[PDB]
Amino acid sequence: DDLLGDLGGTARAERAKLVEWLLEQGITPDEIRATNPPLLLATRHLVGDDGTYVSAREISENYGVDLELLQRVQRAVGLARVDDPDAVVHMRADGEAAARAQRFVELGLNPDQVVLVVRVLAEGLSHAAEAMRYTALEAIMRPGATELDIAKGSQALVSQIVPLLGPMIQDMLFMQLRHMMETEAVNAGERAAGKPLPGARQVTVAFADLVGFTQLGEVVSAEELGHLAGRLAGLARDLTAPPVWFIKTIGDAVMLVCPDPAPLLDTVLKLVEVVDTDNNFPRLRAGVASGMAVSRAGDWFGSPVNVASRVTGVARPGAVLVADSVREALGDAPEADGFQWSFAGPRRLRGIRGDVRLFRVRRG
Amino acid sequence: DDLLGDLGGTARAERAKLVEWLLEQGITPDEIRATNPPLLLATRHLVGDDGTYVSAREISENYGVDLELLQRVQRAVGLARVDDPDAVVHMRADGEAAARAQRFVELGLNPDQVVLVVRVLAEGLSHAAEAMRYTALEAIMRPGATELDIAKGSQALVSQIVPLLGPMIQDMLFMQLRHMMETEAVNAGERAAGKPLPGARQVTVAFADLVGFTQLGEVVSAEELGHLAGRLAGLARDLTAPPVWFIKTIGDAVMLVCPDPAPLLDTVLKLVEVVDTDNNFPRLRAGVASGMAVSRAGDWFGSPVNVASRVTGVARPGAVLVADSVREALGDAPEADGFQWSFAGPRRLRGIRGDVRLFRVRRG
C-alpha cells in the first residue's frame, strides 16, 4: 500500500500479508511505520500499549505526581529520556507506572532511595524481559517462517501467558523479600551507629575464570564464546548453595563470596575440578581472598575482592590459588579439614604494596 | 525468659522488652530462637511467612506441580537448596510461588527456558530486595535506637508500603516488557534461520574505569571505596540516554555499548571529562572498540568487548583511547563530527594476535 517500500521479492510478499493482518488487529498505518520490524506490534497491544501516547507534564495533571520527581524516575527507569514536559512522546501506560512512585515518598520514604529501587528494579527486570521475550520464541519460531506466521503464533501465545505474569512476579518479589537473607543483618554496632545499610563484613571472596578466553573469541564466534561462558555460568550456579553466594558473572569469569571459607573454598575447588573434566571449556583458574568487604546491591567492594581478582590473574590453569588472608580465615580447623595446602610462594601483585603469601589448594 | 541467653547489660535489657512485644505479635518462642537477630520477625509476617513451613514433596500434592520441575526452580530461585522432598523445611508461601511455574510449561514453554526466567528474575529481584530492605531503614533508623524502637517503626511502615508493591512491580514489568527495545529485534536472516535469540550484532562497546582504584582501597575503607565507585556508577547512569546502553558496572569500571559510535563515543568522552572535574575520584581512562557481539541477558560477548577491555588496561589517565575498529565504524562522517582523532600508535595487546592501531579522542 502507501507503506511497504524498499523491500524486494518474497521479502516484500510476506510483509504485505502480515501488514494487512495487523490493520485488522487495530494497528494504525502510522503505528507500523513507527516501528521496524513491525511484527510484534500485534503482541505489544497485549502488555500495555493502547496506541495512546502522552506528555511528561500531563502524566502529572492526570495521575497526581510531582513533575520533577516523575522526570527523575522516568530517567531512572532505564529509558526514554526526554527533557521537556510539554512533549507528547511518553506512552500512556508508562506514565501510570511512573506515577506510582509518589505514594512511596508520601509514606515517608527518601525520594532518592525511592529512585534507587525504581532503577535497580528496572535493570534487573529489563534483564528478565530478555529471557521472557526469547523464551516465547523457542516455542514459536522454527526455520522457514513468514513474518505473519510468527505474529499469529506469538499473538496467541502471549495472550495466554500474560495474565500469568502479574500474579507470578508479585509472589516472586515477596519470596525474595521475606527471605532477604543472613548477612543482610545489621547488628548492634551497626544499629547503635544508626546505619540503615550494613558496613564492612568479614568474608572470603573468590573468582574463577576460563584460561585463554580472550583469543578464544578471536577464533571462535561471538555466539559460540557467549554460549560457552553461559554454560559455565549455570554450571557454577548449581554447585553453589547457601551458605555461599554466587554474586555475579563478569562475562568469562565467576565471582562467589561467602562469610567463611570452607563452603566457598570447596565450591570453587569442586567447580574447577568439574571444568577440568568437561572438554568444551579451556580449564579454570581460581583466586581466593578473605577480609573486610561491603555489599552494595549485588556487588561487593573492599580489599578482599581486589586481591582475589589479582590472584586469579596469576593463578595457573587447573589451580585454585589462595591468599594468606584465607589460610587464617580458616585458622585452627576445628577437627579435620579435607584440603591440601601447598604453599605457592610470595608473589608481588599489581596494585598491592607488600606482596602476598600465596597457597595452592586441592581436594581430598 | 527461657530464651535471651549469652547477652549482657543494656544489650540484654533491650532484647527482653522487644521479645515480649513479639510474642504479642504472634511470634513463637521457637520462631525467635530460629533467627538471630529476631527484630524483623515482626515485619516478616507481613510479606508472606505465616509460620507454616512445608515439605518439598507436598508442595506438589497440594498445589499440583511436578516434583522434579518444582525442585529445579527451587534451586533456580537462588535459594534454600534441599535435596530431599520429604523434608518439611521450605516455608509454605515459597511453595505456592514455585508452583506457579507449571502453568507456563503447560502452555507450551520450554521447561528450561521457563527455569531461566525463574532464575534471572530471582537474581535481579534479590538485588532489589536489598534496595528495598535498606530504603525502609534510612526512614526508620536514627542512632541511639533500641531493638524494639526499630521493630515498632519498621512494623508500622512496611505494613503501609506493602500493598503498594504488588501492583507497582507488575506495572514495572510490563513497562520493561512493552518497551523491550531496539536491537532485541531478530531480522530476516535471523528469522529465516529459525533462531529465537538474536545473533551477533555490529556494535561499539566501551569501558571506563577509575585509575589506581586497587590500592585506593588498600588505604581508604571498603565502605568509602564502595560508595566512591557507586557515585561514578550513577554518575554514568544519567549521561547515558538511548540510543546508548549502560549495560553494567564491574565494581570500579563501567561498561557501555551502543550500535553506532558517536553516541557512545561522546558519552564516554563527556563522562571522563566530568570525572576530570570532580575531585573525590581519581581520574578515568576509557577504552573503546567496535565489532561483532551477542547480547545474552544483560551481558555482551564477542571480540569488541575483549579488545575494549584490553585497551582500557593500556589507556592513560584522562584519556579516552580507541581501537581502529571504531575509527571506521564511524567511517566517512556524513558532514561534521566534533571529535579529535590523535593517532596513538600500534600497541600489542595481551590475548590479541596482531596488534591494534590505537587512537586518542577528545571533545570539541
Give the DSSP per-residue string, A111-176: HHHHHHHHHHHHHHTHHHHHHHHHHHHHTT--SS--HHHHHHHHHHHHHHHHHHHHHHHHHHHHHH
Strand, helix or coil for residue B111: helix
B contacts of A215 (beta carbons < 8 Å)? 351-353
Is residue A32 within 8 Å of A2, Cβ to Cβ?
Answer: no
If 0-12 CB within 10 Å is exposed, 13-18 middle and 19+ buried, where does residue B197 land?
Answer: buried
Nearest neighbour of B200 by CB, restricted to A185, A213, A221: A221
Residues A168 and B166: their CA atoms lie apart, in Å, by 10
Residue B252 annotated in ligand binding: yes
* Alpha carbon distance, N-terminus to C-terminus of chain B: 73
If 0-12 CB within 10 Å is exposed, 13-18 middle and 19+ buried, where does residue B303 land?
Answer: buried
A contacts of B47 (beta carbons < 8 Å)? 174, 177-178
Handedness of CA A221, A226, A227, A231 (dihedral sign): positive
Residue A316 per-residue DSSP state: P
Which amino acid is it at A178?
R
Helices A111-124 and B147-178, packing angle to 10 deg: 50
CB contact (8 A) between residue B81 and residue A225:
no
Q: Is A77 on the interface with B (CB under 8 A)?
A: yes
Taking only residues 101 to 120 of chain B, the set having a beta carbon closer than 8 angstroms to any beta carbon of chain A reads: 103-104, 107-110, 113-114, 116-117, 119-120
Question: What class is the B181-364 domain?
Answer: alpha beta
**CB under 8 Å to B259, separation ≥6 — which residues?**
B182, B183, B201, B202, B203, B204, B243
Q: Where are the domains of chain B?
A: 9-180, 181-364
Is residue A186 within 8 Å of A195, Cβ to Cβ?
Answer: yes
**CB under 8 Å to B30, separation ≥6 — which residues?**
none
Q: ∠A238-A241-A245 over CA atoms, to 5°?
A: 100
Which amino acid is it at B25?
Q
Which amino acid is it at B55?
S
Residue B30 annotated in ligand binding: no
C-alpha cell at B36: 538471630
Handedness of CA A136, A137, A141, A142 (dihedral sign): negative
Residues B271 and B265: their CA atoms lie apart, in Å, by 10
Residue B299 annotated in ligand binding: yes
CB contact (8 A) between residue A108 and residue B139:
yes
Residue A312 per-residue DSSP state: H
Helical spans, DSSP H, in chain A: 10-24, 29-33, 41-44, 58-63, 67-76, 92-98, 102-106, 111-124, 126-138, 147-178, 188-192, 213-216, 222-236, 261-277, 303-314, 324-330
Q: Which residue of A has its CA nearest to B93?
A: A175
Burial of A116-132, coded b for 16+ CB within 10 Å and e otherwise, reads: bbbbbbbbbbbbbbbbb
Q: Is A48 on the interface with B (CB under 8 A)?
A: yes
Phi, psi (degrees; rounded to nearest 5) at B25:
-70, 15
**Residue from A75, A59, A7 nearest A37 by CA:** A7
Query: Closest Cα of chain B to A5: distance in Å?
Result: 16
Parallel, antiparallel or unpaired: strands A320-323 and A284-296: parallel
Strand, helix or coil for residue B256: strand
CB contact (8 A) between residue B121 and residue A299:
no
Q: Which residue of B has its CA nearest to A227?
A: B296
**Residue from A5, A292, A274 nearest B226 by CA:** A292
Parallel, antiparallel or unpaired: strands A284-296 and A201-210: antiparallel
Which residue has 570447596 as its cell numbers? Answer: A266
The 10 Å Cβ neighbour count of residue B278 is: 11
A contacts of B169 (beta carbons < 8 Å)? 121, 169-170, 173
Query: Closest Cα of chain A to B341: distance in Å?
Result: 26
Residues B68 and A111: their CA atoms lie apart, in Å, by 44
Residue B231 annotated in ligand binding: no
Query: Closest Cα of chain A to B335: distance in Å?
Result: 25
CB contact (8 A) between residue B294 and residue A223:
yes
Residue A285 annotated in ligand binding: yes
Of the residues A82, A90, A117, A247, the best mutation for testing chain B's interface (the one with the most B CB atoms within 10 Å of its CB) is A117
CB contact (8 A) between residue B353 and residue A215:
yes
Phi-psi region of B300 (alpha: psi -120 to 50; beta: other; left: phi over 0): beta
**Residue from B339, B255, B266, B252 nearest B293 by CA:** B255
If 0-12 CB within 10 Å is exposed, 13-18 middle and 19+ buried, where does residue A329 land?
Answer: buried
Strand, helix or coil for residue A31: helix
CB contact (8 A) between residue B217 and residue A303:
yes
C-alpha cell at B206: 566501551
Helical spans, DSSP H, in chain B: 10-24, 29-33, 41-44, 58-63, 67-76, 92-98, 102-106, 111-124, 126-138, 147-178, 188-192, 213-216, 222-236, 261-277, 303-314, 324-330
Strand, helix or coil for residue A185: coil
